[PDB]
Amino acid sequence: TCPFYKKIPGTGFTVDAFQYGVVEGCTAYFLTHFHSDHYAGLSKHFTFPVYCSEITGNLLKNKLHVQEQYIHPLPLDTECIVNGVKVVLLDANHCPGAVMILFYLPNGTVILHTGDFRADPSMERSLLADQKVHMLYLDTTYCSPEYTFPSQQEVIRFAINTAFEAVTLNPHALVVCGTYSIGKEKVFLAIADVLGSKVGMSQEKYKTLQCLNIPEINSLITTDMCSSLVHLLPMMQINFKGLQSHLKKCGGKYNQILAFRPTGWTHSNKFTRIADVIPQTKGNISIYGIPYSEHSSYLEMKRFVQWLKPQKIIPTVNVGTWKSRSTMEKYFREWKLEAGY
Ligand code: NI
Numbered sequence: 001t002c003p004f005y006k007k008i009p010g011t012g013f014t015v016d017a018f019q020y021g022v023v024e025g026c027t028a029y030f031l032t033h034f035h036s037d038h039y040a041g042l043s044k045h046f047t048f049p050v051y052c053s054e055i056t057g058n059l060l061k062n063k064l065h066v067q068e069q070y071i072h073p074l075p076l077d078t079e080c081i082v083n084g085v086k087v088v089l090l091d092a093n094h095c096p097g098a099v100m101i102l103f104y105l106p107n108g109t110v111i112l113h114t115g116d117f118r119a120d121p122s123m124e125r126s127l128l129a130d131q132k133v134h135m136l137y138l139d140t141t142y143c144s145p146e147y148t149f150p151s152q153q154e155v156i157r158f159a160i161n162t163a164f165e166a167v168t169l170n171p172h173a174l175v176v177c178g179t180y181s182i183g184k185e186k187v188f189l190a191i192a193d194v195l196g197s198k199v200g201m202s203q204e205k206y207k208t209l210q211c212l213n214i215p216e217i218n219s220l221i222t223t224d225m226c227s228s229l230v231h232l233l234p235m236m237q238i239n240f241k242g243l244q245s246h247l248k249k250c251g252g253k254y255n256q257i258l259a260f261r262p263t264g265w266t267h268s269n270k271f272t273r274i275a276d277v278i279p280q281t282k283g284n285i286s287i288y289g290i291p292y293s294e295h296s297s298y299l300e301m302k303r304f305v306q307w308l309k310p311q312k313i314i315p316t317v318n319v320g321t322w323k324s325r326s327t328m329e330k331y332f333r334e335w336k337l338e339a340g341y
Contacts, residue, residue, distance in 0.1 A: 001059045002014060002017050002020040002023050003313050004254055005137060005315070006321060007023075008103055008111060008113070009105075009109075010105045010109065011083075011103065011105065011108060012025060012026055012027030012028060012083055013026065013028050013029075013030060013082075013083075013085070013103070014026050014029055014030070015032060015072055015113050015115070015137070016030070016031060016032055016038040016039075016103065017259065018031070018038075018039060018040060018041030018042045018046075018114070019028060019040040019041035020041070022048075023087060026048070027049075027080055027083050028048075028049050028051055028083050029048055029049070029051070030050075030051045030052070030101055030113075031050055031051070031052045031056055031060075032052075032092070032098060032099055032100070032101065032113070032115025032116065033053075033056060033092070033094055033095055033097055033098035033099070033115055033116060034055075034056050034059040034060070034063075034095070034097060034177055034182060035095065035116065035181055035182070035183075036181065038115075038116075039060075039064070042060065042064050042066060043064055043065070043066070044064070044065035044066060044067060046066055046070060047070060048070065048101065049070060049072050050066065050070055050071055050072060051072045051087075052058065052071070052072070052073060052074070052097075052099070053073060053074070053076065053089060053097045053098070053099050053273050054073045054097070054214055055096050055097030055211065055213055056073075056097040056099075057072075057073035058211035058212075058213075059097070059182075059208070059211045061154060062207065062211050063207070063208065063211070065179050071162070072244045074089050075089075076089050076090065076091060076099070077089075077090065077126070077127060084106070085103060085104065085105065085106065086103075086104040086204050086280060087101060087102060087103055087104070088101075088104075088127055088282045089101060090102065090123075090126055090127065090128070091126075092114065092116065092117040092118075093117055093118045093119070093120050093122075093123075093294075094115065094116045094117055094183065094294050094295070095116075095120060095181070095183030095184075095294055096182055096183070096185070096212045096213075096214070097182075097212070098115060098116060098117070099115060100112060100114045100115055101113045101115070101132075102118060102127065102128070109134045109135065110131055110132060110133050110134055110135075111133070111134065111135045111136075111137065112128070112133045112135075112136050112137070112308070112310075113137040113316075114136070114137065114138055114139045114316070115139065116139050116141070116242060116294070116295060117139050117295070117296060118231045118293065118294050118295055118296050119296040119300040119301055119303065119304035120300070121303070123304065123306075124307050128308070131310075133308055134310065134311045134312065135307070135310060135311065135312045135313075135314065136305065136308065136310035136312070136313050136314070137314045137316050138297065138301075138313050138315055138316060139295060139316055139317055140301070140315040140316065140317045140318055140328055141264075141296070141317045141318070142264075142293075142295055142296060142297060142298055142301070143298065143301060143315070143317075143318065143327070143328050143331060144298060144327060144331075145298045145299075146172075146270060146298070147269075147297055147298045148269055148270070148297055148298065148299070149190050149264075149265055149291040149293050149297055150274045150291065152186065152292060152293075153291045154205070154274050155274060155290055155291060156186055156187070156292075158274050158275070158277065159187060159190065159191055159260060159271065159288075159290060160190050160194045162190060162258070162288065163175050163191045163194060163195065163230075163258060164194045166256075166258045167195055167229070167258075169285065170256050171213075171313070172253070172254050172255045172256065172262075173254065173255075173256040173257070173258055173310065174229055174231060174247065174250065174254040174256070174257050174258070175191055175195070175229060175230045175231070175234075175239065175257075175258050175259070175260070176209040176231050176232075176233055176243060176246065176257055176258070176259040176260070177191065177199075177231075177232055177259070177260045177262070178216040178232075178234065178235040178237070178238035178259070178260065178261045178262070179205065179231060179232050179233075179234070179235060180234060180235040180236070182208060183214070183215065183294050184262045184294065185209070185212075186292075186294075187260060187262045187290070187292060188230060188232055188260075189220055191230055191260075192220060192228075192230040193220075194257070195229060195230060197228055197229045197230050198219075198220060198221055198222040198224075198227065198230075199220060199221045199222070199228060199230045199232060200221075200222050200223070200224060200225040200227070200228030200230065200231050200232065200268050201222075201223065201225075201231070201232040202223070202232075203223055205232055206221060206222075206223050209221055211233065212235070212292060217243075219258070220291075229254075231246070233246060235261065238259055238260075238261045238287065239287075240282045240285055240287075243257050243259055243285050243287075244285065246254045247284075247285075254277055255284060256284045256285075257284070257286070258279075258286050259285070259286070259287045259288070260287075260288050260290055261287060261288070261289045261298070262290055262292035263289050263291060263292075264291070264292075264293045264294075264295060265291060265293065266289060266291065269287070269291055270337075274291070277290065278287075302331075302335055303336055305332075306335050306338070306339040309339070309341040313332050315328050
């Protein structure tokens with residue numbers, strides 16, 4: 001049964017609630033983004049209206065075979081009426097196609113559902129600037145002050161400089177990047193761009209990327225692995241055994257692998273600066289874990305909330321333990337006392 005924090009009061013709507021069967025009272029199912037913990041349950045046999053971004057709706061039709069007549073894509077930054085309720089979709093700064101949803105309830109209440117997001121000061125000048133928000137359904141993934149990480153731009157600078165040095169030292173080095181979902185495409189695209197190469201990958205992953213409306217993509221990716229020196233592999237294969245096996249398959253074209261695992265946070269964040277990050281090495285294989293996050297840090301989250309000044313916060317992540325829930329509530333009260341709302 002569907003948990004309360006997936007239900008929008010005063011409407012017929014749910015958010016990211018496809019694994020519960022037919023939800024009683026639901027007339028429209030919203031999907032914030034195409035990540036499996038959120039789409040779990042969708043398939044070609046789904047026959048209720050699904051509301052989403054254009055990019056999410058391309059992935060629904062092509063990857064999950066949802067029939068077209070049930071996909072209702074909405075443009076971003078545009079007031080739309082759904083089953084008699086005004087809604088707006090906003091960019092969530094998460095993975096491609098990911099949105100936050102503003103609901104303007106018939107009684108005057110305004111609710112923001114962040115989906116998954118990485119808060120940014122640019123959001124303070126979207127359509128959120130223009131009215132009061134009463135209730136915030138908040139992505140609390142990293143809601144504790146230990147969670148610090150660098151900007152995406154610093155992490156990509158590290159990656160490009162590391163790859164360009166290695167390959168200029170050794171033109172027979174292969175670069176490998178791990179993936180298991182959409183998101184984080186800048187990692188492998190920025191490295192292929194500095195090297196003058198396309199990114200090579202499986203037909204299944206090429207198919208996924210072709211649904212993303214990324215400009216000039218035909219110029220940047222390929223299924224011809226032999227023509228590429230940046231390869232994408234499943235995240236599970238980014239270990240010394242998996243990479244040794246891959247290097248065998250390349251037929252003596254290469255004699256070294258430099259590999260990247262874009263993690264979110266890891267405890268090596270609490271001690272070490274990005275500049276100081278080092279790989280794990282075995283023979284001619286090196287693996288870098290790089291802290292490329294598509295979720296808010298603690299400080300980014302706190303800034304957004306202190307700017308928005310909601311009357312009520314409903315966390316959507318870390319809600320399964322009493323210790324987590326008590327920790328989050330304590331920070332919410334701090335933020336409200338410091339800012340004065
Ligand atoms: Ni996500």
